[model samples]
Target: GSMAEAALEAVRRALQEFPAAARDLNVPRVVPYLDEPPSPLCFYRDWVCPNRPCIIRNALQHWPALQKWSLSYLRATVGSTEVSVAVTPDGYADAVRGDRFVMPAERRLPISHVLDVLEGRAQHPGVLYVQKQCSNLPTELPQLLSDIESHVPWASESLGKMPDAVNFWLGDASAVTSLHKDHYENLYCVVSGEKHFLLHPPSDRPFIPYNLYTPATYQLTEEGTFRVVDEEAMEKVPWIPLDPLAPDLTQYPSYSQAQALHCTVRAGEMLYLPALWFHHVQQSHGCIAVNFWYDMEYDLKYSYFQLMDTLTRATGLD
Candidate 1:
């Protein structure tokens, strides 16, 4: 289901056409979620704005959960929780090992449990799901779902109007999501967390540093996760900031073909990660977040072509 190492030093001259890379910003900006039924052109305008991600506080503005959960409740729920697994990559971000969190709560488990877990008085549950690097906590999801409006932005419809299968992930402190364009556009909401999301425009391959993502194309080559790896493996990938004119092909060769952009998300914010943008999600530091997936209406032909493409490639008939 994958391919081998690829480097793009040969394409150095090609990156000259990319736009100049922009520096990360240190401002607190506000972004409004567009009305659900916006015109195509207007929607396109919103999509094209900014070179980095934004904080869309209004995405679920009508939902009662905003008030119900409260930042305090989230901090306690996330901070007081015990997790089933956490990989080394996630640990690095949090600056701990087998790291269990302290209950930032007054009544949850008392000061004893909080202090015990904090100063290395308790042990973690061990790294359970290394493949996906998942960290599972017994979540009170039912009550959690009941507090939100279903149609805010696009989350509800993606779950068939029900919150049953809208997979929620409470990523481990040092966890990461690997490189690849998403199949669905996602409104990544960070309730009490911080994240570093590296993105590039579609069509730029070299800028992506295809060492792990190879020539066989995306699905077949992209590493599925972007969390912690040994320091050595980290160098195999490039952190792309969307540069429109042309990226440095000499340093990040394949990026010449790639359109790059950059963004960061903080607590109480959401980012509509667009469909078809090559992105890598990193927990820049230890953090907690809440996210829900939504479904969009897609063309039947393209879906079929994708299914067939997977089959064709697998069967060696392509």
Candidate 2:
């Protein structure tokens, strides 16, 4: 028993020290903005290899969507297109509620109808968002693809792989994306309005708390109420229960040591979010954006993070 306790103490020390060393060595205190796009070689060496994030301006200046995309233009272009929308009572699509992980109710509706709701011309019971991230831009709204590039040239060239998924985002300010991390390197481009992001680097994994909860989906009833229906057969999903915007620090005291970088990506700007970085998102009233997801190389960095995750869980730091 004493031997096990000693090992646990060593694991806790490693978890606490890893991120502190990273902060002192390389992680930026703030998300830096670049005036213009970098060359493929420079991008790979400076950002991708080091696993750092940056916002580049004048990157999407040439795209027609930068100037043409607006509520009216979207309505005129793909108004009749049937699209998937995530509806939720409180604006959070997939989040931890009570002891369950609840996902939004997905509804298929015309783009015009969503626009109508966003514009206040129509009334919907729940917050509406066009945030289906399954290569949604090309598959669901192919008609609007002409306005934007199929792939980010410099990013694709540097990564040596085309984007695996190109997603389109459109929603009101009420729609909030919960804190989460992805294995794919992300290039998020804002077409209109602005996006607010709260970021935590992979090293911050030690302080972030996670729990296993039964997965459920939100179902909207005809009476204008929402219901959570659990998926009985599915495995319990592991998720972060802390809300960064209003973090319950008392319950998760370790999070107080985490360094969070906040940034606002405006229209015509792109944010290079490295793989495994945790992010929570919010947007303006009628924000529109597109993102490219490139698969990351499972190199030494990934392996190190995997080791950290296992240690964090074993030490009860998670």
What is the clash count of model 2? 0
Clashes per candidate (backbone, < 3 Å): 25, 0
TM-score of every model versus the real structure: 0.49, 0.98
In the predicted model 2, the residue pairs found to clash are none
lDDT of each: 0.40, 0.93
Candidate 2 to truth, TM? 0.98
Tell me model 2's lDDT, rounded to 2 decimals: 0.93
Highest lDDT among the candidates is held by which one? 2
- How do the residues 1-318 of candidate 2 rate in per-residue lDDT, one tens digit apiece? 999889878878977988989877878888988899999999999999898999999999778999999899989999999999999999998899999999899999999999999998999998999999979999999877888899999889999999999999999889999999999999999999999999999999999998999999999999999999998988998899999998898899999989899999999999999999999999999999999999999999999999888888988897
